[PDB]
Amino acid sequence: ASQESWRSIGSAFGLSGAAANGRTVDGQADVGASLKAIGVSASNITLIPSLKLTAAKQAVSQKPELSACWTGEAGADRATLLVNVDPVMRSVKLAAAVRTPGPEWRKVLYNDETDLLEYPADDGARHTLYVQHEVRGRDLLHATRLGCRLDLGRLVNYVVDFVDYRIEENIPSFVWNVPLLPQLYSLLVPADNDEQVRHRITGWELDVSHDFARSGLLPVVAISKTSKKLLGGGTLTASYDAAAREAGVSLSRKGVSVGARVARAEGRPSIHV
Amino acid sequence: GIMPRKYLIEKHNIKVLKKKLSQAYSTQQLTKVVQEYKNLIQN
Numbered sequence A: 001a002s003q004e005s006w007r008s009i010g011s012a013f014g015l016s017g018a019a020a021n022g023r024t025v026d027g028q029a030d031v032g033a034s035l036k037a038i039g040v041s042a043s044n045i046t047l048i049p050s051l052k053l054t055a056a057k058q059a060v061s062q063k064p065e066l067s068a069c070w071t072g073e074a075g076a077d078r079a080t081l082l083v084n085v086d087p088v089m090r091s092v093k094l095a096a097a098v099r100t101p102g103p104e105w106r107k108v109l110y111n112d113e114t115d116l117l118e119y120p121a122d123d124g125a126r127h128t129l130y131v132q133h134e135v136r137g138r139d140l141l142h143a144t145r146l147g148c149r150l151d152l153g154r155l156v157n158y159v160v161d162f163v164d165y166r167i168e169e170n171i172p173s174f175v176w177n178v179p180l181l182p183q184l185y186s187l188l189v190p191a192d193n194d195e196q197v198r199h200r201i202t203g204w205e206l207d208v209s210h211d212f213a214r215s216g217l218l219p220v221v222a223i224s225k226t227s228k229k230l231l232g233g234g235t236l237t238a239s240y241d242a243a244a245r246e247a248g249v250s251l252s253r254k255g256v257s258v259g260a261r262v263a264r265a266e267g268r269p270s271i272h273v
Numbered sequence B: 001g002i003m004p005r006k007y008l009i010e011k012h013n014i015k016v017l018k019k020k021l022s023q024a025y026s027t028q029q030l031t032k033v034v035q036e037y038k039n040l041i042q043n
Helices: A007-014 A153-166 A181-188 B010-023 B027-042
Strands: A018-021 A032-035 A038-041 A066-074 A077-085 A092-099 A109-111 A116-118 A133-136 A139-144 A204-208 A220-226 A235-241 A247-253 A256-263 A270-272
Antiparallel strands (some): A032 A038, A204 A220, A247 A256
C-alpha cells in the first residue's frame, strides 16, 4: 500500500468502516471512496464517461471478489503481498512490492581519533528497486513490471565503485598510454571523497514497465525526473513504448496531469493534448 | 676491564605500552599511541 507501480479494499483495510478521499489520455481524478462494499474509484478516462462498476462482497457469481494483503517491513525493505481472486476469471492473481532493496556500495569506516565505527550513515532511502511479479492461473509469468524508482545514483555509483577498486588494477598498461583515454577514465570514474558518491545523480528514475503477457520481449521504458524546480514538485515522465508508438510526456503532481501523447511522424511529431 | 651496560628504560616502556594495548583488545590504536610517545621523547 502507498507504493509505486481493488484499491477500495486496501483503503478500507487501512482504516470494517467507510473512508472518502478526494484529489489522462479526460482526467484521471484519482479519488477513493471505500466502504466495507463501495469501491468508488475514478478510472477508464478516455463525452461519454464510462466507469468500471463491479459490486463485490467483502468462485461465485454481483460478483464477490476476495483481496488479501500481507504487509511486513524490515529495516529499509518493505514487503507488500497482494492476492486477488475474482469469481468470473476463477484464477488468482498475485502482487509483490519491495522497497529500497538496493545493493550497498559504501563501507564502514573505523575512526582512530574517536576509536569508534562509522557506519554508512548516508541512508537517504531514495533508492527503490520495486519488483512487481503477477501470476495469473497456470501462467506464472503473467507480468513482470520490474521498474526501479531509485535515483539511479545507486546503480551508477555501484558500477563505478566496482570498476575502480576491482578492475582498474588488472587493466593492461599498454592501453593507458592511448591519448585522451586517461582523461575519459577520470571523467567517467572520479576520485572518491569521504564515503560519499562519486557522481551526484538524484531525482532520475528508470521505470521498466515490462510485461511477459505481451509477445516476445516488448518492455516499456519510462524515465522519470522528480525535482522541486518544476513548479515545486511533480514527476516529469518521458515514457517510450516499443509497441504503442507513443512518447508520453506526463507532468503529474498530486493527481494533476498535463499529458502530451506524442507520436513520431507516421522528425515531425504529432501531439495529443 | 670496562664492560659497558646501557640503561634501557624507553624500550621497556614501549614494550609495556604494547602489552597494555594488547590486553585491551585495541591493537589498532598501537601505531597511533606508540608513535606519539616517541615524539614525547624527542621534545
